[PDB]
């Protein structure tokens, strides 16, 4: 009834080449709605097209987003992370070391130091098991506007939040459309669901 695909188990390991790395991920996740395993998105370059992720609705293991220069990770359809397996034994979502510091300037496509600015998870409502680990993302905004209490399942015994808020740039406020000022990005289509 849903499009199924496997995940990966590479963790923080450095890929053979950026050419094979993105091509493999595109081949794996394009069309996929249910990842039966771990969604790992690592070492992705600044201008990497990630539109193949648009259909992903659930991840059965953990989500790892690490060492990316890509400015935005679009997982706007991701509704649920199960935490059937965990990162560092405790975490269902881990966002780590994503890029380089940048000031308040809106990025210039070929000049501006790369790094994750926003984790676009508008549909995320459920984390069944495991916590959230967000560390060392200089350009990342909006982790601290999110109410993770509403996302953690009531049975989640490992509902941990280890969230670093340190930033190189100031965050633009959520759009007024996001009631309660909780959002994943600066757009009105980025509010917490």
């Amino acid at each position: 009834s849903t499009q199924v695909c496997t995940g990966t188990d590479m963790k923080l390991r450095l890929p053979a080449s950026p050419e094979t790395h993105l091509d493999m991920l595109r081949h794996l996740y394009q069309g996929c709605q249910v990842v039966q395993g771990n969604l790992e998105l690592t070492y992705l370059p600044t201008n990497a097209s990630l539109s193949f992720l648009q259909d992903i609705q659930e991840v059965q293991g953990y989500v790892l987003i690490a060492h990316n220069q890509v400015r935005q990770v679009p997982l706007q359809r991701l509704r649920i992370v199960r935490g059937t397996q965990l990162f560092e034994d405790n975490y269902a979502l881990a966002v780590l070391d994503n890029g380089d510091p940048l000031n308040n300037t809106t990025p210039v496509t070929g000049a501006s130091p790369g790094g994750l600015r926003e984790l676009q998870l508008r549909s995320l409502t459920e984390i069944l098991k495991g916590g959230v680990l967000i560390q060392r993302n200089p350009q990342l905004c909006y982790q601290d506007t999110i109410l993770w209490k509403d996302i953690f399942h009531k049975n989640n015994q490992l509902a941990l939040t280890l969230i670093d808020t340190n930033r190189s740039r100031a965050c633009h406020p959520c759009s007024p459309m996001c009631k309660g000022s909780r959002c994943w990005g600066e757009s009105s289509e980025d509010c917490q669901s």
């Epitope: 510091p101 940048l102 300037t105 930033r167 406020p173």
Partner: single-chain antibody, 233 residues
């Protein structure tokens, strides 16, 4: 990415107590951000002998405690500050300020005439060619959650944004004019920010401020330090 110029009118406004007053701030670029429909414009008040204080950020949002007789209005490039009924205490210079693009800039000012703490180091009297290191001690808030902006203020001139530093990531942005003049450092442990000024000439003689700014709704500069006078002989 051109520098934004803020034009303030009138540059001086004679008033009597009880009068309604309107001052204009016009921008060379729109300050409206289309993603959040917010205008990145603030107003500041500097009374004689005192450091500037935030009145309004966001074109029309007053800082907590500011009298409702002060009203900010306008959008895009056109902005006004109105005082419904002027008090004797309102006699000061009012500066509009943009935080939309680098460098952050101030208007020429309108002269009106008839917990969180930032402790700066004492006055500096130095010679030509010498250096100076101004300290800024922060208290009453989480130091790494905020930026430290540095501002130059001369008698009878509008404030100049020297630049700012991210406390947590030690990321410094400078006004082009101060690139080979000022250098920022921070110490997370002692909640102190530093600015070193080198190759000091007479043009570098002024009052210097450290100013806090934050994130989200607190994006604008809010709390100013008491100031540090540097005189170069």
């Amino acid at each position: 990415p051109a520098d934004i110029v803020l034009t303030q009118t009138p540059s001086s406004l004679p008033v009597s107590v009880g009068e309604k007053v309107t001052m204009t701030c016009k921008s060379s670029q729109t300050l409206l951000y289309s993603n959040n429909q917010k205008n990145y414009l603030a107003w500041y008040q500097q009374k004689p002998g005192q450091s500037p204080k935030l009145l309004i950020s966001w074109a029309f949002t007053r800082k907590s405690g500011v009298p409702d007789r002060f009203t900010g209005s306008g959008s895009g490039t056109d902005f006004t500050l109105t005082i419904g009924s002027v008090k004797a205490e309102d006699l000061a210079v009012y500066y509009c300020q943009q935080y939309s693009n680098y460098p952050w800039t101030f208007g020429g000012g309108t002269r009106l005439e008839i917990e969180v703490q930032l402790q700066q180091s004492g006055p500096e009297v130095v010679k030509t060619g010498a250096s100076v290191k101004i300290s800024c001690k922060a208290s009453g808030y989480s130091f790494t959650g905020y930026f430290i902006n540095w501002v130059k203020k001369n008698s009878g001139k509008s404030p100049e944004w020297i630049g700012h530093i991210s406390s947590s990531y030690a990321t410094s942005t400078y006004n082009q004019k101060f690139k080979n003049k000022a250098a920022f450092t921070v110490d997370t442990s002692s909640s102190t920010a530093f600015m070193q000024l080198n190759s000091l000439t007479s043009e570098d003689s002024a009052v210097y401020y450290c100013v806090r700014s934050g994130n989200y709704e607190e994006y604008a500069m809010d709390y100013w330090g008491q100031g540090t006078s540097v005189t170069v002989s």
